[PDB]
Amino acid sequence: AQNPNCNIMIFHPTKEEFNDFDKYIAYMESQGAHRAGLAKIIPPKEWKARETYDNISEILIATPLQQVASGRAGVFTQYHKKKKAMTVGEYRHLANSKKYQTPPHQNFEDLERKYWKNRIYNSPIYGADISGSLFDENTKQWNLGHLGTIQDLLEKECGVVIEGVNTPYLYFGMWKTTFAWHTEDMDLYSINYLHLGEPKTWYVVPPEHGQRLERLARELFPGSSRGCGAFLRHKVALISPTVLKENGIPFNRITQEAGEFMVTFPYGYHAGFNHGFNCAEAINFATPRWIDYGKMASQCSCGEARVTFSMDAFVRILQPERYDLWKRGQD
Numbered sequence: 001a002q003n004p005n006c007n008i009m010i011f012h013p014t015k016e017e018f019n020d021f022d023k024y025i026a027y028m029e030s031q032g033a034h035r036a037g038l039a040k041i042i043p044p045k046e047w048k049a050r051e052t053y054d055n056i057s058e059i060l061i062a063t064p065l066q067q068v069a070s071g072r073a074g075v076f077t078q079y080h081k082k083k084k085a086m087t088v089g090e091y092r093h094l095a096n097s098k099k100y101q102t103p104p105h106q107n108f109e110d111l112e113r114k115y116w117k118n119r120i121y122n123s124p125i126y127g128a129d130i131s132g133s134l135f136d137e138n139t140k141q142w143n144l145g146h147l148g149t150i151q152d153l154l155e156k157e158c159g160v161v162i163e164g165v166n167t168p169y170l171y172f173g174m175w176k177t178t179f180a181w182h183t184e185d186m187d188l189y190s191i192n193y194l195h196l197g198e199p200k201t202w203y204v205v206p207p208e209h210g211q212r213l214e215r216l217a218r219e220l221f222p223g224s225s226r227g228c229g230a231f232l233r234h235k236v237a238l239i240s241p242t243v244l245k246e247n248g249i250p251f252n253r254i255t256q257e258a259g260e261f262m263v264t265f266p267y268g269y270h271a272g273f274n275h276g277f278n279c280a281e282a283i284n285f286a287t288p289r290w291i292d293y294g295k296m297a298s299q300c301s302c303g304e305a306r307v308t309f310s311m312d313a314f315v316r317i318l319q320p321e322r323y324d325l326w327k328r329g330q331d
């Protein structure tokens, strides 16, 4: 078995190898990459996402989210308070202010320590989940706005024809902005490209051990667990590496820098934070191997997680028994 310790693998494709996205994903899996839950892909040196970022300040963040924490430093929840709209120019200036900027630090490790020590005492503002793309239309390789769609994957593998569309989303981050422990909707893959700015640190649990993280989360967030049988779908819970180590949960960590892709694999729980002002683009995708994970994915039926138009069809076709009760939560 390849990659039996479930380490995060890093790939350096040549420009020739960067032409066929599906094939490269299948290659990475042939080497065991999926066992980690997360892989890094460093694009060929010749490749670029776009020519410059010189005119991005005019993008609107219509609903910036202030991430307010509750709990203790290693075990907390976050709630997202909606703020008034601001442009990326406004947001970047805010990120760089004395109140919100990255503190002085020695290296990524010292900054990681400062994040876990101090996150809960601050409320950074995240411009998340903005439909759009920063890839130039002429970028032909690994352009997250030109991938094969999940609906088309389901049609090719299963023959069924469904409504829905699949488009990317932009994320504008600042110091301490946080993504809580989650898997993707319907346990899909994700791919995330860091267009610009400061790094993003990731933590991940191998898919084969995801249920160990779930059991810990039920112990650490016991009222959330009683409220919903899949409350990590709410994307609100944080658990630090120290706490994971104390409880014997297998995990890995890696820092993504500007110009790099990350791939998350089906049922790979992940969480993380941004080091400073940055912009990432991400989208879900499927392969044939995903189909069985889609059939088995948990669902939030308490109604909090409240998910997309396109996820309806996935549930209807892959989880017809759940269909009914899941759409009662989503209506």
Ligand SMILES: O=C(O)CNC(=O)C(=O)O
Pocket (backbone or CB within 6 Å): 171, 178, 179, 190, 191, 192, 264, 270, 280, 282, 283
């Ligand atoms: O970048 C972020 O804030 C969160 N991204 C993801 O969880 C992802 O790409 O799957």
Ligand SMILES: [Mg+2]
Pocket (backbone or CB within 6 Å): 055, 056, 057, 058, 059
């Ligand atoms: Mg602009």
Ligand code: NI
Pocket (backbone or CB within 6 Å): 182, 183, 184, 190, 264, 270
């Ligand atoms: Ni994710």
Ligand SMILES: [Zn+2]
Pocket (backbone or CB within 6 Å): 227, 228, 229, 230, 231, 233, 234, 300, 301, 302, 303, 304, 305
């Ligand atoms: Zn729920």
